[PDB]
């Protein structure tokens, strides 16, 4: 069993690392509005959207019972962005960096729990 406070205290810095990255995290900070961007095929391809603000909300309200659940959600966010965008799109490169930074911070923390 984990309590909501310990999970937030343990994992929030890894999420903060992602938020720290400017301008990489900016498009990930809130959920996409595909009609606004003119990419109306987005929810055809990305079946389960995920963004930093949803992950932060779940960690703040303790909707994660287990730390794997917070880790699924981060990878869901990256896998969505890699699924939808071309390898040469600016969002692709951004997702690639945040993914890069997330590995450096997550591994030590998961061993700690
Ligand atoms: C209501 C929030 S919003 O939808 O407007 N926020 C934005 C989100 C996203 C976005 C998020 N994800 C995960 C994707 C993705 O996978 N593919 C394409 C776009 C995006 C892009 C948004 C923006 C805003 C500008 N942008 C744009 C499209 C953008 C592109 C690249 C990097 C940053 N911003 C932009 C910037 C300047 C001028 C015109 N458009």
UniProtKB/Swiss-Prot annotation:
Q: Altering residue 87 to E: what's the impact?
A: Impairs binding to acetylated histones
Q: What mutagenesis or variant effect is reported for residue 92 to C? A: In RSTS1; mild form; impairs binding to ASF1A and acetylated histone H3
Q: Which residues cross the membrane?
A: none
Tell me which residues make up the Bromo domain: 2-109
Where is region (Interaction with histone) located?
A: 41-87
Mutating residue 97 to E: effect? Abolishes interaction with ASF1A
> Could you describe the post-translational modifications of this protein?
Methylation of the KIX domain by CARM1 blocks association with CREB. This results in the blockade of CREB signaling, and in activation of apoptotic response. Sumoylation negatively regulates transcriptional activity via the recruitment of DAAX.
What results from changing residue 82 to A?
Answer: Abolishes interaction with ASF1A
At the top level, the lineage of the source is: Eukaryota
Region called Interaction with ASF1A, residue ranges: 79-97
Where would you find this protein in the cell?
Cytoplasm; Nucleus
Q: Which disease is it linked to?
A: Chromosomal aberrations involving CREBBP may be a cause of acute myeloid leukemias. Translocation t(8;16)(p11;p13) with KAT6A; translocation t(11;16)(q23;p13.3) with KMT2A/MLL1; translocation t(10;16)(q22;p13) with KAT6B. KAT6A-CREBBP may induce leukemia by inhibiting RUNX1-mediated transcription. Rubinstein-Taybi syndrome 1: A disorder characterized by craniofacial abnormalities, postnatal growth deficiency, broad thumbs, broad big toes, intellectual disability and a propensity for development of malignancies.
Function recorded in the entry? Acetylates histones, giving a specific tag for transcriptional activation. Mediates acetylation of histone H3 at 'Lys-18' and 'Lys-27' (H3K18ac and H3K27ac, respectively). Also acetylates non-histone proteins, like DDX21, FBL, IRF2, MAFG, NCOA3, POLR1E/PAF53 and FOXO1. Binds specifically to phosphorylated CREB and enhances its transcriptional activity toward cAMP-responsive genes. Acts as a coactivator of ALX1. Acts as a circadian transcriptional coactivator which enhances the activity of the circadian transcriptional activators: NPAS2-BMAL1 and CLOCK-BMAL1 heterodimers.
Q: What's written under domain?
A: The KIX domain mediates binding to HIV-1 Tat.
Quaternary structure, from the entry: Found in a complex containing NCOA2; NCOA3; IKKA; IKKB and IKBKG. Probably part of a complex with HIF1A and EP300. Interacts with GATA1; the interaction results in acetylation and enhancement of transcriptional activity of GATA1. Interacts with MAF and ZCCHC12. Interacts with DAXX; the interaction is dependent on CBP sumoylation and results in suppression of the transcriptional activity via recruitment of HDAC2 to DAXX. Interacts with phosphorylated CREB1. Interacts with CITED4 (C-terminal region). Interacts (via the TAZ-type 1 domain) with HIF1A. (Microbial infection) Interacts with HTLV-1 Tax, p30II and HBZ.
Name of the protein in its database record:
CREB-binding protein
Give the shown range, full length included: 1084 to 1196 of 2442
